[PDB]
Curated annotation (Swiss-Prot), chain A:
Coiled coil: 1-116
Residue range from the parent sequence: 498 to 646 of 794
Natural source organism: Tetrahymena thermophila (strain SB210)
Family: Belongs to the CFAP184 family.
Name of this protein: Cilia- and flagella-associated protein 184
Consequence of gene loss (knockout): Mutants swimming speed is reduced compared to wild-type with trajectories wavy and kinky. Cilia length is not affected.
Subunit structure, interactors included: Forms a complex with CFAP263; the interaction is required for functional activity in cilia.
UniProt-annotated location(s): Cell projection, Cilium
UniProtKB/Swiss-Prot annotation, chain B:
Organism: Tetrahymena thermophila (strain SB210)
Protein name according to UniProt: Cilia- and flagella-associated protein 263
Disruption phenotype: Mutants swimming speed is reduced compared to wild-type with trajectories wavy and kinky. Cilia length is not affected.
Domain of life of the source: Eukaryota
Coiled coil feature spans: none
Subcellular location: Cell projection, Cilium
Location of this fragment in the whole protein: 105 to 201 of 361
Function in brief: In complex with CFAP263, acts as a regulator of ciliary beating that connects radial spoke 3 (RS3) to the inner dynein arm (IDA) and the nexin-dynein regulatory complex (N-DRC). The complex is positioned parallel to N-DRC and forms a connection between the arch at the base of RS3, the IDA tail and N-DRC.
Complex and partners: Forms a complex with CFAP184; the interaction is required for functional activity in cilia.
Family: Belongs to the CFAP263 family.
Length: 149, 97
């Protein structure tokens, strides 16, 4: 009454209360389906998240082993002639440069992968748009193909 | 809800794949560095490692990965044209439909 018009459309055709109950049961079914769909969605999301956590932890452990070996060698790194090890500033500069380049290639890999997936989806869409028109899309030329026969 | 959950799924899967690739490349770099330094990067006369060889290895690795980035950019440009053409094709097909 406060939002929609107060006019009642009782002069229309008598919509069946059976139809109303059908729509109510459809609403209940759609709500339940929403529930179970979000159930599976959360299930797969959590599975992906845990797998990503495991992969990231393995990557981190291997990366830190590599970095510890790198630093072990780096402080070992002293000139052959002067025998003065690598300047700590020079080692830090190398570390920053290497980490930045690796990270940059990493987001490049992210973007390339996502763009390539979007690519595959776009070729799939282009092929899938074979539907004729309107309206009857495939059966139309199927019967049309019948006469071509 | 289905759209949002699906999208979070693709985000998680993309992060998975990129983390796997990061692991792969990090371990490849670890192998390369260990081969280059712990095998041929330590001073023999003094018993220490050499600073200059570690230098050259750092700059060479950075240059190689930056060439990787340059080829990445070339592929990204190619894919930019391809994406533009595909978007035009999809929009025209939708309009005709």
């Amino acid at each position: 009454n406060k939002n929609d018009g107060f006019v009642d459309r009782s002069n229309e055709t008598a919509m069946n209360e059976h139809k109303y109950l059908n729509t109510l049961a459809h609403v209940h079914q759609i709500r339940l389906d929403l529930k179970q769909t979000q159930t599976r969605y959360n299930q797969m999301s959590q599975e992906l998240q845990k797998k990503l956590e495991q992969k990231q932890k393995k990557c981190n452990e291997i990366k830190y082993a590599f970095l510890e070996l790198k630093r072990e060698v780096a402080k070992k790194a002293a000139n052959s002639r002067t025998d003065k090890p690598i300047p700590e500033q020079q080692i830090n500069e190398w570390e920053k440069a290497e980490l930045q380049k690796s990270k940059e290639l990493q987001e490049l890999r992210l973007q390339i992968l996502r763009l390539r997936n979007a690519y595959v989806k776009n070729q799939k869409i282009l092929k899938k748009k074979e539907e004729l028109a309107e309206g009857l899309h495939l059966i139309d030329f199927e019967q049309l193909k019948i006469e071509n026969q | 809800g289905r759209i949002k959950s699906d999208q979070i799924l693709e985000t998680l899967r993309a992060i998975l794949e990129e983390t796997d690739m990061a692991i792969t490349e990090i371990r490849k770099d670890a192998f390369d560095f260990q081969r280059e330094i712990l095998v041929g990067g330590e001073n023999s006369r003094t018993g220490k490692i050499e600073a200059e060889k570690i230098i050259k290895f750092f700059e060479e690795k950075e240059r190689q990965k930056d060439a990787l980035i340059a080829k990445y950019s070339s592929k990204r440009t190619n894919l930019e044209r391809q994406i533009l053409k595909t978007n035009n094709q999809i929009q025209k097909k939708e309009e005709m439909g």
